[model samples]
Target: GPVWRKHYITYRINNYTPDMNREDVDYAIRKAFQVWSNVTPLKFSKINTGMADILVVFARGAHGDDHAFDGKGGILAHAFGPGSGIGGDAHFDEDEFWTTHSGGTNLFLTAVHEIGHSLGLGHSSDPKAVMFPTYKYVDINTFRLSADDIRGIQSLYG
Candidate 1:
């Protein structure tokens, strides 16, 4: 159920629509990637549309495919399991106020969790884990990868 190899993922901004301004949106996405980059052996590069393995898009409700989102709360964001098409794809509900800090649950935090799923992770028993499946608005300063998360990602690419 796992393999060992570094994943060089790339991300693209599909929608420049947000209440948080364009610069903040870009900054949040970049910071999200920085979160994983700081902890994992994996490396990331920002590339053009045709260069990334993961396509980051912002859309709302039944955008396409079977996993059509339900706009706003309930499911903040989600990712498709590894495969073709929407495979390795990450979607954020534009309805949410994606922010940098705890003012709105931290976009970087939720994003890091979603990416864990894109990389083949699931809800862990550990609440501190990025793969915890549900949103966790825990204190930001104390947040970091849990042992479960560590083992999970390493199991896939160690």
Candidate 2:
């Protein structure tokens, strides 16, 4: 997978999902990027329009890319690694009930994992890692990246 060549990365929320409020969606995505930024020198900026390093979107099956998301339950979301065009794009399955809390699929945690992929990270074997293959809901207020995650991202960015 390719890592971003630059430190200041830009991202854009192409659209919003009805599953979550606009403010919650924005905050979740913002905090997701913050997770990586906190461990590295990288900076993320959200753009309203135009091309950005990463394009965040919520869609159902066959959104546009070749990898169409399953209806629900199977795969929550997916993201491309660093590169031009669709390389850093992230697509979430709108069929799932996205939420700020653990009542449903927590957008913040999901975005953190997908954004890890966008930032050129592969799934970690560590079950506690944010980049772990499985999705588990954790208290967002107390959530912290595992040592393996910090070491992985810092190894690439630093």
Best by lDDT: 2
RMSD of each: 2.2, 0.7
Per-residue alpha-carbon lDDT of candidate 2 for residues 1-158, written as tens digits (9 for 90 to 100): 58999889999999999987899999999999999898898999999988999999899999879998889789999999999999999999998899999887999999999999999999899999999999999999989999999999988888
Error of 1 at 71 (Å): 2.9
Model 1's alpha-carbon lDDT is: 0.72
Model 2: residues >4 Å from true position, as ranges?
none
lDDT (0-100) at residue 110 of candidate 2?
A: 96
lDDT agreement with native, every candidate: 0.72, 0.93
In candidate 2 the C-alpha lDDT for residue 13 amounts to 96
Off by over 4 Å in 1: 1-6
Q: Tell me each candidate's TM-score.
A: 0.85, 0.98
Clashing pairs in 1: none
